[PDB]
Motif scaffolding. Structure first.
Motif, PDB file in Angstrom:
ATOM      1  N   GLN A 247       0.837  -1.225   0.000  1.00  0.00           N
ATOM      2  CA  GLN A 247       0.000   0.000   0.000  1.00  0.00           C
ATOM      3  C   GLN A 247       0.867   1.268   0.000  1.00  0.00           C
ATOM      4  O   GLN A 247       0.308   2.367   0.076  1.00  0.00           O
ATOM      5  N   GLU A 248       2.178   1.119  -0.119  1.00  0.00           N
ATOM      6  CA  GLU A 248       3.063   2.305  -0.146  1.00  0.00           C
ATOM      7  C   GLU A 248       2.809   3.152  -1.406  1.00  0.00           C
ATOM      8  O   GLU A 248       2.985   4.376  -1.341  1.00  0.00           O
ATOM      9  N   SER A 249       2.428   2.527  -2.518  1.00  0.00           N
ATOM     10  CA  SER A 249       2.190   3.294  -3.767  1.00  0.00           C
ATOM     11  C   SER A 249       1.070   4.306  -3.548  1.00  0.00           C
ATOM     12  O   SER A 249       1.198   5.459  -3.969  1.00  0.00           O
ATOM     13  N   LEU A 250      -0.008   3.872  -2.918  1.00  0.00           N
ATOM     14  CA  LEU A 250      -1.074   4.843  -2.563  1.00  0.00           C
ATOM     15  C   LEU A 250      -0.584   5.753  -1.426  1.00  0.00           C
ATOM     16  O   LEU A 250      -0.975   6.926  -1.377  1.00  0.00           O
ATOM     17  N   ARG A 251       0.247   5.216  -0.537  1.00  0.00           N
ATOM     18  CA  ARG A 251       0.761   6.047   0.578  1.00  0.00           C
ATOM     19  C   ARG A 251       1.749   7.087   0.034  1.00  0.00           C
ATOM     20  O   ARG A 251       1.792   8.206   0.583  1.00  0.00           O
ATOM     21  N   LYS A 252       2.499   6.725  -1.011  1.00  0.00           N
ATOM     22  CA  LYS A 252       3.521   7.661  -1.533  1.00  0.00           C
ATOM     23  C   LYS A 252       2.880   8.492  -2.631  1.00  0.00           C
ATOM     24  O   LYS A 252       2.301   7.917  -3.567  1.00  0.00           O
ATOM     25  N   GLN A 253       2.999   9.807  -2.497  1.00  0.00           N
ATOM     26  CA  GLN A 253       2.390  10.713  -3.496  1.00  0.00           C
ATOM     27  C   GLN A 253       3.435  11.723  -3.933  1.00  0.00           C
ATOM     28  O   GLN A 253       4.113  12.315  -3.070  1.00  0.00           O
TER      29      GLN A 253
END
Length: 49
Positions: free
Chosen positions: A5-11
């Motif tokens: 879920q880091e991809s959604l967490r990383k912006q």
């Protein structure tokens, strides 16, 4: 296997611009269909043409 879920967490700024294009285009497309879906006569005429 790789689920995270880091991809959604990383912006990022590019990612911010990307999904902001995404919602504004969703809104434009949405009012487009909202006005279009009521009168199939013009679509029938342009299909015969």
């Amino acid at each position: 296997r790789m689920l995270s879920q880091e991809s959604l967490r990383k912006q990022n700024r590019f990612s911010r611009a990307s999904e902001k294009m995404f919602d504004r285009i969703i809104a434009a497309y949405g009012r487009g269909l909202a006005k279009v879906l009521n009168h199939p006569w013009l679509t029938l005429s342009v299909a015969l043409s």
